[PDB]
Target: Mitogen-activated protein kinase 14
Amino acid sequence: RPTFYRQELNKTIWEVPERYQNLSPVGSGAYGSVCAAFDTKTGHRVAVKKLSRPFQSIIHAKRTYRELRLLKHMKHENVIGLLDVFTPARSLEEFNDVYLVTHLMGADLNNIVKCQKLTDDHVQFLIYQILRGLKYIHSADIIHRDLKPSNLAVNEDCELKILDFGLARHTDDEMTGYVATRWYRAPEIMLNWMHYNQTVDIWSVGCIMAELLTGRTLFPGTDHIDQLKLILRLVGTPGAELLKKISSESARNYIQSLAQMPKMNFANVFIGANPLAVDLLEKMLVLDSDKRITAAQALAHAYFAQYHDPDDEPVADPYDQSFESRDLLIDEWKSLTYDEVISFVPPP
Ligand SMILES: Cc1ccc(C(N)=O)cc1
Ligand SMILES: [Cl-]
Ligand SMILES: [Cl-]
Ligand SMILES: [Cl-]
Ligand SMILES: [Cl-]
Ligand SMILES: [Mg+2]
Model:
């Protein structure tokens, strides 16, 4: 057991191992209560997040366990991973606080997409790294569900990692109106048309790639219905085959009220873009999710010729999420969380 010391931070007393020095607040609270620190063991600048009294309800106790399982699983260059996890508690009986230690990624895609001139070669490398990460994530049967520029960390060398695992489900208020949180969502999840799957994440990659090429949001809707109209104007109204797959009868009736529209010509929308980037955008932004390109197929597309290495695009160990369908008491979720904390083995 390491030696711990105390100091006053973000309105509570933090108790952390001596290895973590020069703690000070960072971010706007998007990902929780977070300080930056210097890690004397690895030499990295790190983010330390404190979950205080997080076994306060069944929902919160299950969420805590979920975030710890997902972060412990993810071991990939283009994905956020767990450097360390700790509690100052000496036993289960006094266990109350969880601290997570992850790589400190200062800038996101939002802080360079607007304030910088991105060449075609920049767009190739950034989207390449998102798809390499996604291939890994999807091989574990994990769906991200929230890919957007603020969830992508980028350094001065244009190296990228994907964030946002096992946090609270976004609320109905968070998805209302003129908001970035909805602009990247696949239409089948934004309107609950059907049971969604990992294909929702490829729609999000399409919206991100378009924005890097044009400097503008692809579908900046003022509400769910305004956004749907922007989508259908680009990709066309649904045909008979997709309409059959929309389970909600009410959603199907609404769709059939709209005047039919053809798919637009993407070379006249993305004027001047690499024709290989136009072709890839057409394969991601397909309304029928069954027909979208997969992350694994997209990595082999000609647009990524100068980056693609099929011997360096790894897949994930299998990820058991049977806990997702399990009903437990607060103290049971808390005990499983304590076991995951004490069993943690750090990376090389
Ligand atoms: C600093 C930090 C950032 C992201 C996450 C996460 N659960 O995705 C955790 C911690
Ligand atoms: Cl220490
Ligand atoms: Cl504690
Ligand atoms: Cl964003
Ligand atoms: Cl597992
Ligand atoms: Mg999110």
